[model samples]
Target: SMEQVAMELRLTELTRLLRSVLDQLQDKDPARIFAQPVSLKEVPDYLDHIKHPMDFATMRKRLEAQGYKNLHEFEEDFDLIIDNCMKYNARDTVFYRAAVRLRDQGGVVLRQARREVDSIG
Candidate 1:
């Protein structure tokens, strides 16, 4: 029983450490967080043709009306939508790929804005 508890505690610590490392990696480059290799340049066109249940246009309008001006402002919602799409549709399907691409695009924009602000301040 003692050995089991010790192993469980060690597993918990290892999980926490892994999560911390993943968070750091995501902060550095979110595009690399995806399961598959993504092409930032080609993502936009791919998103154009792929269709999904999530009405991103409506969601965008709702966020804008709620005073969320940028992707960073509603980042969590975007992440949720992307996750939902991936769950409902196969991860290898066009819908999942498109959702991921869209999310990555917004992340890239947000990262650029942060860089610009950092340079200015």
Candidate 2:
């Protein structure tokens, strides 16, 4: 139950902090706000829409359009989010541990799926 509680708390805190960061960016640096927070409330829609980044060049293009400049810059945003997620609520939990595994596996599968589709196309 501790794990569940920790996860719920972290999840709440993460979303709140991320939204605040987004709001700040929107107000202070709109041009650098390459993307919006992926709403956890829309997890179902997110899962359905999620695709390999490579396969979705338009997403990259959009970030680039915002002056992201390159893949490395775009990747830094991902790192920034993770850092912020941990910063606001720095603690480990069974759910976060499991969720990390799921994220890694899912990313691998998505890449493979995208590669297969690319090959065929």
Candidate 3:
């Protein structure tokens, strides 16, 4: 029971840090583009271009469910969200620009998170 408590507590801490990244991302997303999945209503062919779609909404649910074992894994999913956007949208579009911005911003936020998480180790 003691070790179980410790593990759960640590997991909670990890997710807490990860949650902040998502919070900050949402704050930065002016159009809330990445908040939810690529809209089927808006772009019917998004899935045709994006092989693997991801978004903050899905990440939030998974993070709460302990779907990510570490920050690296979380980073992978985060990358996917941006990567998918870039792949689907042209360079001239705002969606592509947002993807680039979020990717860079997320990298900075994740680097900070890594320090805190490393200290956790």
Candidate 4:
């Protein structure tokens, strides 16, 4: 009974959070969302350039037109996936690696998102 309750609770929280994140992703300001820092060192170099001080806002707008609402949104999705994977399945090496990867990238992404917000009026 306790195990079932714990599992259910975890699932419920995750589901709710994920749905909220999805909703937030839509109709979000791309510049604001992409300004958050992405924590990953290995995130593509192209992404680094996209967030460079001179070009970040413009690049973010272009990325939004291309269907990326915000860079942090991608990090959120990855986090949700990792959470689900780790919750249902035992922690495999792959899962551990994925978790780490998401955290690192999430920082860089969040940085860009914050920058975007700061630049706004």
- Which parts of model 4 have CA positions greater than 4 angstroms off? 1-78
Ten-residue segment with the worst summed lDDT in candidate 4? 51-60
Worst 10 residues of 2 by lDDT: 51-60
User: Clashing residue pairs in candidate 2, if any?
Assistant: none
- Candidate 4 yields a Cα-based lDDT of 0.44
User: How well is each residue in 14-62 modelled by candidate 4, as lDDT tens digits?
Assistant: 4444344434443232333233333347444534433322122333343
Worst lDDT 10-window in candidate 3 = 21-30
lDDT of 3 at 53: 86
In candidate 3 the C-alpha lDDT for residue 19 amounts to 88
Q: For candidate 2, lDDT tens digit of each residue in 60-107?
A: 344434434333443445444334333332369533343344335434
The candidate, 2 or 4, that scores higher on TM-score is 4
Best by lDDT: 3
Give lDDT: candidate 2, residue 31. 30
lDDT per residue for candidate 3 within 3-118, as digits (tens), equals 98899888887888888877887677778889998788888987788878899899999999987778899989988988888888899999999999888776777778889888
User: How many clashing residue pairs, candidate 1?
Assistant: 0
Q: Each prediction's TM-score against the native?
A: 0.40, 0.30, 0.91, 0.32
